[PDB]
């Protein structure tokens with residue numbers, strides 16, 4: 001409700017659309033974050049749509065989705081603050097970067113935790129069909145081995161210049177063949193993207209790489225990639241390989257994934 005209700009501790013990071021800061025809620029000393037967004041250049045139309053997105057965001061209550069908490073406006077700076085759950089383990093990009101630097105592969109048990117809890121996150125997103133971009137940077141870890149989807153697509157609308165540069169410069173490593181060939185909404189497309197993510201978690205590189213977009217498109221089109229490292233079981237390799245099937249209808253559904261014998265209770269969330 002009010003900015004005075006919170007005490008900024010420090011800046012965790014400057015995103016493309018503003019700062020993310022670690023904050024303490026005064027009422028109870030609860031540690032949270034907020035996302036600092038300047039809406040000064042927005043039209044009335046863009047702000048109502050922003051309001052719409054926030055309302056849908058607050059409507060997501062799931063252990064495996066970064067939890068929404070509050071909205072605060074300081075009109076003096078034309079700054080909107082979105083209070084979110086603090087995820088102490090950081091994002092998966094950093095984890096993958098750390099794995100490369102230290103020359104160490106991630107435990108299969110970890111990959112199974114992400115697989116399980118991210119699939120559950122997806123099942124929830126689909127039920128409510130909404131931003132579900134599954135890049136490692138959009139995936140967070142708390143302090144209890146819980147995995148949370150935190151795609152803050154919301155913020156694109158604030159600066160169209162930065163949003164255009166992000167869309168044009170960036171390489172869609174996780175782009176499904178359907179979505180490349182002029183497609184739209186299909187939940188099997190999200191399964192392919194999850195496959196890419198789990199693959200990158202295992203191999204520390206995405207399944208398809210190129211220096212060019214049309215070279216990347218050729219690679220994806222062919223649907224060939226290296227097997228994930230041999231430290232990972234044939235079972236985990238078969239499931240990931242399955243999510244990366246050229247045909248969306250050959251990819252496993254959320255339900256089919258969760259039926260896999262690899263996935264056990266301890267792989268799910270515990271708060």
Ligand SMILES: Nc1ncnc2c1ncn2[C@@H]1O[C@H](COP(=O)(O)OP(=O)(O)OP(O)(O)=S)[C@@H](O)[C@H]1O
Nearest residue numbers: 012013014015016020033084085086087091137152
């Ligand atoms: N809920 C959260 N809990 C803890 N840390 C977070 C949370 N959200 C973001 N971070 C971290 O804060 C830093 C800033 O990133 P963000 O501004 O959230 O997004 P960004 O990737 O920089 O920009 P985007 O994706 O366009 S919103 C990153 O290092 C994140 O790992």
Ligand SMILES: [Cl-]
Nearest residue numbers: 100103104105
């Ligand atoms: Cl290595």
Ligand SMILES: [Mg+2]
Nearest residue numbers: 015137138152
């Ligand atoms: Mg982000």
